[PDB]
Amino acid sequence: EVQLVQSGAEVKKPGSSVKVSCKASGGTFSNYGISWVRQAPGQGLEWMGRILPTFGTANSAQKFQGRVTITADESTGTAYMELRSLRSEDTAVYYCAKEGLAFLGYGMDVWGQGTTVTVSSASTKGPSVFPLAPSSKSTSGGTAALGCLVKDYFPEPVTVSWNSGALTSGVHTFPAVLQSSGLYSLSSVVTVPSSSLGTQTYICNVNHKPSNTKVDKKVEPKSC
Amino acid sequence: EIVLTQSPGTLSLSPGERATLSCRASQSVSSYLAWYQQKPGQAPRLLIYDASNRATGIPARFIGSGSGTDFTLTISSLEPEDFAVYFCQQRSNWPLTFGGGTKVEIKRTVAAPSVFIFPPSDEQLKSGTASVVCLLNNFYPREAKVQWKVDNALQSGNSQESVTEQDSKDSTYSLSSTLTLSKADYEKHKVYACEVTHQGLSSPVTKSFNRGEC
Amino acid sequence: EIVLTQSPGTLSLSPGERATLSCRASQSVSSYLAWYQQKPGQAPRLLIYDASNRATGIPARFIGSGSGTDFTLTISSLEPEDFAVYFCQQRSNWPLTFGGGTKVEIKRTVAAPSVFIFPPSDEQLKSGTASVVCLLNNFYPREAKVQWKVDNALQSGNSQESVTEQDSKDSTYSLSSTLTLSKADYEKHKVYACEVTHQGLSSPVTKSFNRGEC
Amino acid sequence: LYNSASFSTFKCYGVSPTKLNDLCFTNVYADSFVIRGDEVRQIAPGQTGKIADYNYKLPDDFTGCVIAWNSNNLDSKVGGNYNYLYRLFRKSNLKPFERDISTEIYQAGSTPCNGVEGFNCYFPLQSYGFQPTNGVGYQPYRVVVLSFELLHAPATVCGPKKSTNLVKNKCVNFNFNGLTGTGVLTESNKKFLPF
């Protein structure tokens, strides 16, 4: 059961350089053939190139020529896939997987874990929490939905919990969307019976790890 | 450079039925193909290699066939843990391209999209940016369109959609669209409305609100 | 078990040169082997038996050679009714398996593949399935690739690429690909194209039509 | 080797199995490798395929002996045994009893490869997925190929045929180191020299 421990998330800036590692859990290498696969956010997979660790051979896809440089270190069993001249669209989740010392046939079977590599041009920014009041309390007389909008934060992720995680029924968390400016935003709403309104207090909390912020917005009705 | 396609793109099926995915090629890839099974937010895993063999540990319900320029992956019994995106990778020669994908969903009865709207808050109005949120919750199927009608005028180019994944308890979606615009623009109209059109709706339900008075 | 490899696969040659058909064997089949000739649409009559003899009625044109494990057929001054696939099957031990065979054909100058497109008619639209056919007439050599770009999207061969037999006058090929789809799939597309990639042509030509407006 | 009850494919062509220890041969060669199940058949003399063509070609006029027995306990570990390679691409065929270990990238097309794999330029070798859980025919088979040559040198390996007891005081047939005859053997009082 060969494992492939991979690096961690690395936010970078346009035009910079990145270096992802695919250390093989177990020691040194063998008759491998590790190859690198890139997956854009919410898209299909995309092959990049492969390396032969022990036999000392590597190449990249024709589209990535002159930009990707795959190297291996058989002493420690670690393969690197340094990428230079990072573009704005190169943000993706980069994988590494072994495919047998060959070129055609078997196909990759043991994968790493993914290394998110968001490339942009903005420093960490606190997320501005804004409450969405349960407006128009006349939908169906017994159902209501309310949430708190999280806007202009960077970078991912930001977990959202309601009442310190004491409520999960009818709770949604939409995926973050990259705005034109370059900051992320996501909503999080909860469906609550109209009877509970005006009697139970709901507070949503956020936890932006890079900016270590703990906000607590207590949602309110329209305040007459 | 060989290109692969997968048909169809959605392949909506209910549990217990039989699936049929076709990764039709473009050249001679006679017996060199592989199928991957990626659940959301995870790493892909190998299923079928050389278009007939099955990888170790895979349940026998997965059968692959076909050769030449037209292959087919067939699933006999759809377990709940078989709904994912299925990728095909041709391994004939350089480069080892991939396929589009086929997100296999759950098939259920049609449901009605509950609609809610939220005006921008006063605290959100401290800066010069105002955002309006129209929300659709527990609907099916995926196809749904939202249009904004600020001052009875169609608005475009300033909205962003966001769809959750299928729920694990009722298999219903949930869509949210935002209308980000400047404070001065928010002060240069009267009424705001979001219009939703769905297969499960007899009429295009539209929710609206007026500024200030609430 | 014995295996009889065949090389080459097509052996494109001219009327009146040296042919070097080979029958690379497995075992010691020194002299128990035969060659056959199958005219398309006919029964494969015998040509050579015991690897060095000749059947009755066989002209001096066909001369055989080879022994042991290597066996070769030499055709002297090819003749127009001597272009047919040749099978060499051993008759040493059980079983008497055949070979793949090589379809000898005429070598001519590279030609330009013409392209035609025919959309379905109203009568074909009375059914539940459409019928879109491309056409590649009078081209050379055999190898080709036909693709469809529907709505500027890479569609793949939802069809059966049919190739006709070599011409008896010009010795050129004709290709077809009946891209078929359902009526419901017909109306949600807008442009259909037939991509052609050829060695003889430097740039891939494409013939397309727009549905309805025609 | 014969009465071992552990060899799957103790069969061979040049000479009879029962007369192996009857002929004194020259320096017997021995080959060794591990292979799948589907192609132990083509390790025989005179076959063509993938391994009999580019890896280990055996001459038709073969006079050796071929061994093959299953070892799905030592060369198969969980996660595969990516340590047993085999060539699957070559310019031409292979002459009998030839060795090739060069790892120049094979060029299937008509374009320079520059020592780096690319379009129509495959790596020559290939690994074996020796999983512990495979059907028979994919499990490893250790193979030993023998060869007996009739070199003009006298001989170097004879057979340990037999040696029996001796009964004296009877008219019996005898054979001592090739010296046969008949007569009655009795103890002597001679003074033989060591040589």
Residue numbers in the entry:
A (entry chain D): 1 to 224
B (entry chain E), C (entry chain K): 1 to 214
D (entry chain C): 368 to 562
What sentences appear in the manuscript?
After the ACE2 binding, the S protein is cleaved into S1 and S2 subunits by host cellular proteases including the transmembrane protease serine 2 (TMPRSS2) to promote fusion of viral and cellular membranes for viral entry. To understand the potential mechanism of action of B8 HuNAb, we performed a cryo-EM single-particle analysis of B8 Fab bound to the SARS-CoV-2 spike ectodomain trimer.
Two B8-spike complex structures were determined based on 351,095 and 616,799 particles collected, respectively. The other structure at 2.65 Å resolution contained one spike trimer with 2 RBDs in the “up” conformation and 1 RBD in the “down” conformation (2u1d), where each RBD was also bound by one B8 Fab despite the presence of two distinct RBD conformations. After superimposing the “3u” and “2u1d” spikes, a ∼53-degree rotation was observed between the “up” RBD (red color) in the 3u spike trimer and the “down” RBD (gray) in the 2u1d spike trimer. Cryo-EM analysis further indicated that B8 is a typical class II HuNAb that binds to the SRAS-CoV-2 spike RBD in either a 3u or a 2u1d mode.
